[PDB]
Amino acid sequence: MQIFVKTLTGKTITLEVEPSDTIENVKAKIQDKEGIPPDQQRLIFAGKQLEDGRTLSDYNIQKESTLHLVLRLRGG
Amino acid sequence: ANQQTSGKVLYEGKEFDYVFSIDVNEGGPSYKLPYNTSDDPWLTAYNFLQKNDLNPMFLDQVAKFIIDNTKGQMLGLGNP
């Protein structure tokens, strides 16, 4: 399914992935399109950050839901 | 004109300068972070953080936006 990701500035981008796709691959696709590194790229949904070892069905992501795409403060 | 409350953002019955919709959840409490033209990102964010009780992880997310509110990178961008 496709998800609507919202960047810090409010930029809305749609990402096409599979239900059995892990968040890590989703990040990789975003790193392919926009070029945002999967490491600094922080995805928050429902108040919880999306881990790499998680699928779309893991967080029970709603079809075309609002995913928060932000960065990180502490690098180490 | 300082006659009508149009020159202010009335959120949840409270007047403030700027407000940011914290769409951290879908189908629940619509969090709205209030910011004034004389506050510091981390300070205002922290005030709201402990006002409606939010996890410190969201402090960074909200602070980042407030930082550029009066800076000029993606929001009020222009001449460097």
Structure description:
Chain A: The record marks 68 as: Essential for function. Chain A: Residues 1-76 form the Ubiquitin-like domain. Chain A: The modification ADP-ribosylglycine is found at residue 76. The complex is a heterodimer of chains A (76) and B (80). Chain A is an alpha+beta fold. Chain A has a single domain, classed as Ubiquitin-like (UB roll) (Roll), CATH 3.10.20.90. Chain A is 14% helix and 29% strand. The longest helix of chain A is centred in the middle third of the chain and has 11 residues, at 23-33. With 80 residues, chain B is α+β, with helices and mostly antiparallel strands. Chain B has one domain (1-80): PFU (PLAA family ubiquitin binding), C-terminal domain (Ubiquitin-like (UB roll)), CATH 3.10.20.870. In chain B, α1 (41-49) packs across α2. Chain B is globular.
Present the secondary structure layout.
The complex is a heterodimer of chains A (76) and B (80).
Chain A: E1 2-7, E2 12-16, H1 23-33, E3 42-45, E4 48-49, E5 66-70
Parallel strand pairs in A: 1-5
Antiparallel strand pairs in A: 1-2, 3-4, 3-5
Chain B: E1 9-11, E2 14-16, E3 18-22, E4 31-35, H1 41-49, H2 57-69
Overview in brief:
The complex is a heterodimer of chains A (76) and B (80). Chain A is built from one helix and five strands; from the N terminus they run ββαβββ.
Essential attributes:
heterodimer, A: 76 residues, alpha+beta, Ubiquitin-like (UB roll), 5-stranded mixed β-sheet, 1 helix, globular, B: 80 residues, two-stranded antiparallel ribbon, two-stranded antiparallel sheet, 28% helix, 20% strand, Phospholipase A-2-activating protein (chain B)
Tally of structural domains of chain B: 1
Shape of chain A: globular
Topology as H/E string of chain A? EEHEEE
- Described by its quaternary structure, the protein is heterodimer
Summarize the amount of helix of chain B as a percent range.
25-40%
Order of SSEs of chain B: EEEEHH
Question: What would you call the shape of chain B?
Answer: globular
Report the top-level CATH class of chain A: Alpha Beta
The CATH topology of chain A corresponds to: Ubiquitin-like (UB roll)
Q: Using the 3D structure, state the CATH architecture of chain B.
A: Roll
